[PDB]
Structure 1
Amino acid sequence: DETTALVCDNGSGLVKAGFAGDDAPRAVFPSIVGRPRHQGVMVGMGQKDSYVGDEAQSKRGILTLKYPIEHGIITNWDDMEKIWHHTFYNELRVAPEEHPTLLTEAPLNPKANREKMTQIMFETFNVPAMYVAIQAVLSLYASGRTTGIVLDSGDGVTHNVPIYEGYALPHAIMRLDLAGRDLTDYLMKILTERGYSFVTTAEREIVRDIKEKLCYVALDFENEMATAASSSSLEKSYELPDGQVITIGNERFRCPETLFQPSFIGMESAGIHETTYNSIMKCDIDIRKDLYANNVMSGGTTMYPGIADRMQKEITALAPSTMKIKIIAPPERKYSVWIGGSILASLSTFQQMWITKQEYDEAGPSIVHRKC
């Protein structure tokens, strides 16, 4: 495509990338760089120093896999440039020199994370203009709403942004460094109870697939525990890559329950239901009622079966009995940040919001803090 914007949701777990004005991301792949563990022994092949995304998942038995993003912060900048080069050259197949690029970020991130995204886009990729949107603000453009509280959860961050009539309330923004990778590390810990030992970075990706397929949220957790103690009716099974069958029971709701009980992974924080209610209770007069009725959910760790019924129950239990608690959890919610980023980057009134390379030449990487 010739003159469109690029929208690139660089989440902690997956890169989701595409053009603005599309319905969905063209490239969706793991936010992973993989490097070989072993020495190559047939000196007769083109073997890379490193592999990215779906190259690396196909190779992963011989690789060690590393995520450059952890808790929404780019911890390795060489591996992140390898991911962005793969995203543009291999996956989208674009010159980024020709496209304004919308990036996304969690709220309450280190300021250095935007400045280095900015510096790398203008100095390395020679992007003509660039912007960094807050991820939970994007899921409202996808929802067709000016008002709502948004729970967004990815691989590394859960965050709660309340917005009323198009205004964000930045004192009421909650952030929880607990999401999909934390629930995966806790499922690897739980799986040891049946003797299934997963420890390598490739086995972390096997357990990530178990969580994505078998796990669900209990409507009443103690009644599901009582049901799993007294029957096999909650047990399911999983063929591992080498043909071994796992069988799993209460492990499949104890993993997701860590969202409602952060103390399972040793954290002191309130659960996602309390964090959502506490973010509503930080807000103004007429606006509490409209946040309860527009409680939007976003990002991949909101995809467990039953999590909207659990959230609607737990928030109904905290809020007044006359409030209409209503949870917006669409089927497409796994891509809601990218979908909403496609809308933002398309809007006529957004086209003056971009940081142009002229503005980055006048003032250095610190330009993001004025513009975004």
Structure 2
Amino acid sequence: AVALVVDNGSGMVKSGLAGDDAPKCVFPSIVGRPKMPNIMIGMEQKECYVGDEAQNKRGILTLKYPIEHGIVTNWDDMEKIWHHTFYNELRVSPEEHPVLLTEAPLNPKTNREKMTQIMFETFDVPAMYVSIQAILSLYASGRTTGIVLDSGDGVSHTVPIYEGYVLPHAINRIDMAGRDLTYHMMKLFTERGHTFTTTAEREIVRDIKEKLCYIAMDYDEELKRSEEHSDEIEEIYELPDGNLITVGSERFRCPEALFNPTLIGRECPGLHITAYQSIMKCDIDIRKELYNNIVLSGGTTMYNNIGERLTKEMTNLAPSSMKIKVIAPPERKYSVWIGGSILSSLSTFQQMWITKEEYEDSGPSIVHRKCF
């Protein structure tokens, strides 16, 4: 039977059938609830909107995210999202297809235990398997050795792998991703005169950041040019209500927080520093191959001139006799799903599944012995 690949994250959720080269259903993971009285008798209303319907009618809805920092806070909303994905988006019965789920490294055991319990006791799936996102990201690139720098919506992590062997003592994870960048962008916009506070305004700011941001090679030079050639940097954006907003110096000052987290008041190191620290925790003979297979993945790495900036930063830290090559292939925003689809279509993988009998006999703890 064809397996279901469901990559659930903080911001977006991707779902599809194992065997394709692109996800089938990509939708935001939000739950909307009405806050205004209903007075028009005759129409059929709903108590909760999930997915695109919640985003379209966000004007009269309060929006909640059931996943924060890769950890599920409310399980009812997550169960509703899973039900919507299975019964509305994919329109496939969740009882004849094995499930392949993804999880971030260094997560509490209770999250996996509850996820497995919900999958086996609510949807009654035949089999399921949970895998780390970095492994699937490395699978999607068709390589066996490299360091994966993944940056999603809530969690950014770094995982090195050498010749199919992972080094768990050199795995890094920090909670600083596109959401903090959106908050920083809102704070920067408050200095221009525009104030955004509501959830709909937050989505508008997120869209503005996605459409009109880039990474400057030299931050100081562009900052100097911002006060002298602002006409080149200014960009006009049309708000949904018809007003116009001028985005100027905020185009590159917002993504700069990745390489200097002190702007947003975070003591954690930057991205290049984290990668260098992760490389230096491995053996001496392993570092040479890791320096040449830096793979980028995640939606937060979809900016412009990011690979060149990362290469320049790594050059000033790595020894002058090494070769640094950053791998930023196109369509890398769906690399995890592609890797999961590739993994699920292998004959050797057809044995590493958690069947119903094993879960019923051993219990929910079996996920700590067969899934890694």
Could you state the TM-score of these two structures normalised by the residue count of structure 1? 0.98
Considering only aligned residues, what root-mean-square deviation do their CA atoms show, in Å? Answer: 1.0
- Residue 223 (structure 1) aligned to one of 221, 226, 233: 221
1:249 pairs with 2:248:
yes
1:299 pairs with 2:298:
yes
Displacement of 1:111 in angstroms is 1.1
Aligned partner of residue 215 in structure 1, secondary structure: coil
CA–CA distance in structure 2, aligned partners of residues 246 and 359 of structure 1: 58
Contact 1:64 1:202 in 2 (8 A): no
Structure 2 match to 1:115: 113
Structure 1 match to 2:341: 342
Aligned partner of residue 96 in structure 1, secondary structure: coil
Structure 2 match to 1:91: 89
Structure 2 match to 1:55: 53
Residues 299-323 of structure 1: CA deviation (Å, up to 9, x unaligned): 1000011111111111111111111
- Residue 165 (structure 2) aligned to one of 156, 160, 167: 167
Structure 1 match to 2:363: 364
CA–CA distance in structure 1, aligned partners of residues 169 and 235 of structure 2: 43
Residues 134-159 of structure 1: CA deviation (Å, up to 9, x unaligned): 11111111100001100111110101
CA–CA distance in structure 2, aligned partners of residues 369 and 77 of structure 1: 21
Displacement of 1:285 in angstroms is 2.7
CA–CA distance in structure 2, aligned partners of residues 264 and 348 of structure 1: 49
Identical amino acids, percent of aligned pairs: 76
Structure 2 match to 1:65: 63
Displacement of 1:43 in angstroms is 2.0
Residues 100-147 of structure 1: CA deviation (Å, up to 9, x unaligned): 000001101111111111111111111111111111111111100001
1:18 pairs with 2:21:
no
CA–CA distance in structure 2, aligned partners of residues 366 and 249 of structure 1: 53
CA–CA distance in structure 1, aligned partners of residues 91 and 329 of structure 2: 30
Structure 2 match to 1:8: 6
Contact 1:227 1:234 in 2 (8 A): no
- Which runs of 5 or more residues in structure 1 are unaligned? none
Aligned partner of residue 318 in structure 1, secondary structure: coil
Displacement of 1:68 in angstroms is 0.5
Displacement of 1:235 in angstroms is 1.8
Aligned partner of residue 149 in structure 1, secondary structure: strand
Structure 2 match to 1:190: 188
Residues 47-72 of structure 1: CA deviation (Å, up to 9, x unaligned): 11111111111111111111101111
The residue type equivalent to 1:198 in the other structure is F
Structure 2 match to 1:274: 273
Aligned partner of residue 45 in structure 1, secondary structure: coil
The residue type equivalent to 2:352 in the other structure is M
Number of aligned positions between the proteins: 370
CA–CA distance in structure 2, aligned partners of residues 219 and 354 of structure 1: 46
Structure 1 match to 2:206: 208
CA–CA distance in structure 1, aligned partners of residues 222 and 9 of structure 2: 32
1:311 pairs with 2:310:
yes
The residue type equivalent to 1:247 in the other structure is T
Displacement of 1:265 in angstroms is 1.5
Moved beyond 2 Å, runs of 4+: none
Structure 1 match to 2:285: 286
Residues 11-35 of structure 1: CA deviation (Å, up to 9, x unaligned): 1110000011110110000011111
The residue type equivalent to 2:141 in the other structure is S
Structure 2 match to 1:130: 128
CA–CA distance in structure 1, aligned partners of residues 109 and 218 of structure 2: 40
